[PDB]
Design goal:
Number of helices: 4
Protein name: 26S proteasome regulatory subunit 8
Organism: Homo sapiens (Human)
Strand content: 5-15%
PDB class: protein binding
CATH class: Mainly Alpha
Helix content: 55-70%
Subcellular location: Cytoplasm; Nucleus
Family: Belongs to the AAA ATPase family.
């Protein structure tokens, strides 16, 4: 639970690099919702966002997938 905002965002950019992010997604806004998250939890938000997409037979991940993932992993 040590990575700061920029450190969190960097973890998000790294793991989203190969995902098919929908046009206009905002990873910084996702980082802002994660104060106090461990680096692993940030990674989890990426993978969990992907799972929400697959669950809906979607190859493209949306801001909502990410939003829902954050609440899932931390809440």
């Amino acid at each position: 639970p040590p990575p700061n905002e920029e450190a969190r965002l960097d973890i998000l950019k790294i793991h989203s690099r190969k995902m098919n992010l929908t046009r206009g997604i905002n990873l910084r806004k996702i980082a802002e919702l994660m104060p106090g998250a461990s680096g692993a939890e940030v990674k989890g938000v990426c993978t969990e966002a992907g799972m929400y997409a697959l669950r809906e037979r979607r190859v493209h991940v949306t801001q909502e997938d990410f939003e829902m993932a954050v609440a899932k992993v931390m809440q």
